RNA sequence: CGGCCCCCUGGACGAAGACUGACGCUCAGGUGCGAAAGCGUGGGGAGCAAACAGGAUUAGAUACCCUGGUAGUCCACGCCGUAAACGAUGUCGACUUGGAGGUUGUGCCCUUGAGGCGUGGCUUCCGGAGCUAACGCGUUAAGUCGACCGCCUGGGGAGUAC
């Protein structure tokens, strides 16, 4: 999992951000772990789930203008 | 206090008293809690669960909440004709119009909570939890819509009120 | 149950000592034990009066009692026989003849031992204590001061457990060195044993009832103060 | 008064924004978005604007006291101006929670302020350490900034003057429990619900928010002014 | 229910033209139909694994944990259809402020940005009336209701006994 997609300009440290798009996730991540059939649909596919903390933050920005904390 | 009826002097019917404390990190809570009903014989919603450090202060706090922001309820002393199918937090009541010639039997304090409410003749046995705190709540949810008509034009009665909104 | 005793660090500045005399080391124990005996046996006689403090003082060839009271007339009794009997026994205990004065009475309703006799009476007399702690506090704050603490112990209601209760209201400093501030711990008996109230009351952060002397050394005494600087 | 159609229009052609979110109970006064920009509906607003302004002229002779609440970084200079003078009270260094319900208390701490201000100027609290005296000067500055436009208020107000409700809901809640009529200016994310009169608006555009409050403020303040004049006019007619 | 195709083919979502005209709701009994392993014969078998064995723990059961290691897991047809069987939210239908996300029939637009409005579609965020013990639900209800059916009536002992 140095990830086959080549890093822009080659260097001794791999640019792990610039490389992954959908590798390792779900396929080679749960190594030495119990495989489930249908749990992965709700267990791993968490892109909506992780957006909510960013939204919460983008809401509280506005309120800090109205409170005069900002 | 604020919107309350032409009560004159206080009902000071204290229904329960407690003291509650966690003692987990630094001793007890010294405060008491109090449950008090304040009416006037003529129909009120006045009911207060409040709390403060000592028993005199507990009652007066509780009574202050029995007396602020409490609607007038416009019943004929101990008779009521238009009660409500009372629900408050699983504690269920179903009063209905009824004579004052037949009396009221009710255990404990219940004729006394009911007496200052004016709903003592219409009351019929409660259901759900018979926990002393919520069992007495007849006079709150059970009085929100009402009348006690004395008018001869009761049989026109919604009509007269309807043609005025036109 | 914490703290070095709250009035005890205050004893060197703006709080007076409870006794003031000096004996040159070797006779200091003999004077301290007599100063105790006058405290113990004299107060036994005035049992029926009400009193806030006892202050014992020893000039040359004399012992002066100061006593601080709920009123000026209370210790004197009918036609001064009573106050002579007090001086009689102060003269019998002490290696000298005796003087007694009653002080000027100032804040006797807010004073350390007289406010605590008023509060101890409720517990002594086995009243319900449903409203007591609030009526004690109501009257201290109605007659004066700036803050009060009361702590009551001795198994309230007759209990077979340790049982304490307390009340603080206003301002009550604890680690302050300046002004007099009044504390008393009462001891008293009832049917079931000994009861006791610990009472801090706080009158003011500046109090002039004991204050430093009028002058420094440098302006005081003789007008021509400079030395010859030898020349015997 | 005739004012009410010119103020609402001048202000309102900003059409707001607040992205496409908004609040459903405000929906009647909202036209549908024009390519991910929010648009006001003004025509349903013309009944609302006139009604509030006619009732404000009327209470002018009955009231002693207005209170300007709902301050923000954008609303403060409009909160200072609308009061114009001290029969009309305002906060711009924050509203604090409970300023009306515990008015008993607020009035005790104001008495601590106008006392300890005349004291600081004689020099009286500067004693002990300089730290103990500067640390008092700094809490006195904060108290002073917070209270500076409400220090003479003799009682609970006759009305509540709200310039946005979005974040200041407790002040309104209590004012209704004291039975005080609230005169509201709401943004799109605000609800018109649960207060007595609305000027439906939006919180963006500095030119809109200034105009809503000036329309609402002018009617009651110069209304009051006219109540005062009529007393003058009664003696004077005989020699006129 | 997830590789891609072909053959047979269900069910739901739209839309115009058009037709019938209560032909409707619910469903005991009922017949059909399995997540999972269980499982009979045939086919298939690569790894992994209950047990089993031994180490390791002392922490006890060969368990846990690690290494060896088998039935099993896998397909086809077939037998009693089990559970936390799911939005533990019955069915279908009528009524109740809405905006917007995901994304799609389709009316309109330079489709000014998984964009905007008209009107259907499942799917979801927010919150109002109502509803809750409380979290929560809220136009896809756990609201207002409709009929009809299904099931529950203190714990332990019993999902066993009969």
UniProtKB/Swiss-Prot annotation, chain A:
List cellular component terms (GO): cytoplasm; cytosol; cytosolic small ribosomal subunit
A single Gene Ontology MF term assigned here is: structural constituent of ribosome
Comp. bias intervals (Basic and acidic residues): 59-70
What does the record list as GO biological process? cytoplasmic translation; ribosomal small subunit assembly
From the UniProt record, report the name of the gene that encodes this protein: rpsU
Please verify whether the record's keywords include RNA-binding.
Answer: yes
The Swiss-Prot or TrEMBL record describes its family as follows: Belongs to the bacterial ribosomal protein bS21 family.
InterPro entries per UniProt? Ribosomal_bS21, Ribosomal_bS21_CS, Ribosomal_bS21_sf
Q: Under what name is this protein listed?
A: Small ribosomal subunit protein bS21
From Swiss-Prot, chain B:
Per UniProt, residues of the S5 DRBM domain are 10-73
Please identify the protein, giving its name as recorded: Small ribosomal subunit protein uS5
Similarity comment: Belongs to the universal ribosomal protein uS5 family.
Native species of this protein?
Escherichia coli (strain K12)
Q: Which GO terms describe its cellular component?
A: cytoplasm; cytosol; cytosolic small ribosomal subunit
Write out the GO MF terms. Answer: rRNA binding; structural constituent of ribosome
Question: Which additional comment does the entry carry?
Answer: Altered uS5 proteins have been identified in a number of mutants. Some mutations in uS5 have been shown to increase translational error frequencies.
Q: Which UniProt keywords apply?
A: Acetylation, Antibiotic resistance, Ribonucleoprotein, Ribosomal protein, RNA-binding, rRNA-binding
Q: Domains: what does the record tell us?
A: The N-terminal domain interacts with the head of the 30S subunit; the C-terminal domain interacts with the body and contacts protein uS4. The interaction surface between uS4 and uS5 is involved in control of translational fidelity.
Free-text function comment from the UniProt entry: With uS4 and uS12 plays an important role in translational accuracy. Many suppressors of streptomycin-dependent mutants of protein uS12 are found in this protein, some but not all of which decrease translational accuracy (ram, ribosomal ambiguity mutations). Located at the back of the 30S subunit body where it stabilizes the conformation of the head with respect to the body.
Report the PANTHER family cross-referenced here.
MITOCHONDRIAL RIBOSOMAL PROTEIN S5 (PTHR48277:SF1)
Query: What happens on changing residue 111 to G?
Result: In strain: NEA-314; neamycin resistant
Swiss-Prot record, chain C:
The record, for InterPro entries, names: KH_dom, KH_dom-like_a/b, KH_dom_type_2, KH_sf_prok-type, Ribosomal_S3_C_sf, Ribosomal_uS3_bac-typ, Ribosomal_uS3_C, Ribosomal_uS3_CS
Keyword rRNA-binding on entry? yes
The residue ranges of the KH type-2 domain are 38-106
Q: Which GO terms describe its biological process?
A: cytoplasmic translation; ribosomal small subunit assembly
- Mind telling me which Gene3D superfamilies this protein's record contains? 3.30.300.20, Ribosomal protein S3, C-terminal domain
| Keywords of this entry | Ribonucleoprotein, Ribosomal protein, RNA-binding, rRNA-binding
Query: Which top-rank group of organisms is this from?
Result: Bacteria
| Keyword flag rRNA-binding | yes
GO cellular component terms attached to this protein's record: cytoplasm; cytosol; cytosolic small ribosomal subunit
> Which terms in the Gene Ontology molecular function aspect does this entry carry?
mRNA binding; rRNA binding; structural constituent of ribosome
- Family membership, please give it: Belongs to the universal ribosomal protein uS3 family.
Known partners and oligomeric status: Part of the 30S ribosomal subunit. Forms a tight complex with proteins uS10 and uS14. With proteins uS4 and uS5 encircles the mRNA as it enters the ribosome, which may play a role in mRNA helicase processivity. Some nascent polypeptide chains are able to cross-link to this protein in situ. In collided ribosomes contacts ribosome rescue factor SmrB.
Q: What does this protein do?
A: Binds the lower part of the 30S subunit head. Binds mRNA in the 70S ribosome, positioning it for translation.
What name does UniProt use for this protein? Small ribosomal subunit protein uS3
Q: Which organism is it from?
A: Escherichia coli (strain K12)
UniProtKB/Swiss-Prot annotation, chain D:
Q: Name one GO biological process term.
A: ribosomal small subunit assembly
The name under which this protein is listed is Small ribosomal subunit protein uS2
Q: Residues bearing N6-succinyllysine?
A: 114
Q: Name one GO molecular function term.
A: structural constituent of ribosome
Checking Pfam families in the record gives: Ribosomal_S2
The record describes the protein's role as:
Required for ribosomal protein bS1 (rpsA) to bind to the 30S subunit.
Stored Gene3D superfamilies: Glucose-6-phosphate isomerase like protein, domain 1, Helix hairpin bin
- On whether Ribonucleoprotein is a keyword of this UniProt record, the answer is yes
Listed PROSITE patterns: RIBOSOMAL_S2_1, RIBOSOMAL_S2_2
Alphabetically sorted, this entry's keywords are:
Ribonucleoprotein, Ribosomal protein
Name one cellular component (GO) term: cytoplasm
Subunit structure as annotated in this protein's UniProt entry: Part of the 30S ribosomal subunit, contacts bS1. Some nascent polypeptide chains are able to cross-link to this protein in situ. In collided ribosomes contacts ribosome rescue factor SmrB.
Ribonucleoprotein in keyword set: yes
**Which family is it part of?**
Belongs to the universal ribosomal protein uS2 family.
Taxonomic superkingdom: Bacteria
């Amino acid at each position: 999992p140095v990830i086959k997609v080549r890093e822009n300009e080659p260097f001794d440290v791999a640019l792990r951000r610039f490389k992954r798009s959908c590798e390792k996730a779900g396929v080679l991540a749960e190594v030495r772990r119990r495989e489930f059939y249908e749990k992965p649909t709700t267990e791993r596919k968490r892109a909506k789930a992780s957006a909510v903390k960013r939204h919460a933050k983008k809401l509280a920005r506005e309120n800090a203008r109205r409170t005069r904390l900002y | 206090a604020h919107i309350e009826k032409q009560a004159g002097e206080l009902q000071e019917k204290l229904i329960a008293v407690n003291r509650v404390s966690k003692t987990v990190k630094g001793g007890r809570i010294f405060s008491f809690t109090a449950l008090t009903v304040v009416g006037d014989g003529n129909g009120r919603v006045g009911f207060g669960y409040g709390k403060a450090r000592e028993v005199p202060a507990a009652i007066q706090k509780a009574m202050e909440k029995a007396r602020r922001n409490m609607i007038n309820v416009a019943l004929n002393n101990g008779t009521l004709q238009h009660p409500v199918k009372g629900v408050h937090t699983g504690s269920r009541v179903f009063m209905q119009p009824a004579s004052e010639g037949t009396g009221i039997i009710a255990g404990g304090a219940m004729r006394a909570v009911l007496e200052v409410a004016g709903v003592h003749n219409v009351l019929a046995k409660a259901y759900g939890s018979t926990n002393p705190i919520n069992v007495v709540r007849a006079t709150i949810d059970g009085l929100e819509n009402m009348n006690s008509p004395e008018m001869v034009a009761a049989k026109r009665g919604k009509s007269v009120e309807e043609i005025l909104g036109k | 149950g914490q703290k070095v005793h709250p009035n005890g660090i205050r004893l060197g500045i703006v709080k007076p000592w409870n006794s003031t005399w000096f004996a040159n080391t070797k006779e200091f124990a003999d004077n301290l034990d007599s100063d105790f005996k006058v405290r113990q046996y004299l107060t036994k006689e005035l049992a029926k009066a009400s009193v806030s403090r006892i202050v014992i003082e020893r000039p040359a060839k004399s012992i002066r009692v100061t006593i601080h009271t709920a009123r000026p007339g209370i210790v004197i009794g009918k036609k001064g026989e009573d106050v002579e009997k007090l001086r009689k026994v102060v003269a019998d205990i002490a290696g000298v003849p005796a003087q007694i004065n009653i002080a000027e009475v100032r804040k006797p309703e807010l004073d350390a031992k007289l406010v605590a006799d008023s509060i101890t009476s409720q517990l002594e007399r086995r009243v319900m204590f449903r409203r007591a702690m609030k009526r004690a506090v109501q009257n201290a704050m109605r007659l004066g001061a700036k803050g009060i603490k009361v702590e009551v112990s001795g198994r309230l209601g007759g209990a077979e457990i340790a049982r304490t209760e307390w009340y603080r209201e206003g301002r009550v400093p604890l680690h302050t060195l300046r002004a007099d501030i009044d504390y008393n711990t009462s001891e008293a008996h009832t049917t079931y044993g000994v009861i006791g109230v610990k009472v801090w009351i706080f009158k003011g952060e500046i109090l002039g009832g004991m204050a430093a002397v009028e002058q420094p050394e440098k302006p005081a005494a003789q007008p021509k103060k400079q030395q010859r600087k030898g020349r015997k | 008064a005739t004012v009410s159609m010119r103020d609402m229009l001048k202000a309102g052609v900003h059409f707001g924004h607040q992205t496409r979110y908004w609040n459903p109970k405000m929906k009647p006064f909202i036209f549908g978005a024009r390519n991910k920009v929010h648009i006001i509906n003004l025509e349903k607003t013309v009944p609302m604007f006139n009604e509030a302004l006619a009732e404000l002229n009327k209470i002018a002779s009955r009231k002693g006291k207005i209170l300007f609440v709902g301050t923000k970084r954008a609303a403060s200079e409009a909160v200072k101006d609308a009061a114009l003078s001290c029969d009309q009270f305002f906060v711009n260094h924050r509203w604090l929670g409970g300023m009306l319900t515990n008015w008993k208390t607020v009035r005790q701490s104001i008495k601590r302020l106008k006392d300890l201000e005349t004291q600081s100027q004689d020099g009286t609290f500067d004693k002990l350490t300089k730290k103990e005296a500067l640390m008092r000067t700094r809490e006195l500055e904060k108290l002073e900034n917070s209270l500076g436009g409400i220090k003479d208020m003799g009682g609970l107000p006759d009305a509540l003057f709200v310039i946005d409700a979005d974040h200041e809901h407790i002040a309104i809640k209590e004012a209704n429990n004291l039975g005080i009529p609230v005169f509201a200016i709401v943004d799109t994310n605000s609800d018109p619900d649960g207060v007595d009169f609305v000027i439906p608006g939006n919180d963006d555009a500095i030119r809109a928010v200034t105009l809503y409050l000036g329309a609402v403020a002018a009617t009651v303040r110069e209304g009051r002014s006219q109540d005062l004049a009529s007393q003058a006019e009664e003696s004077f007619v005989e020699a006129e």
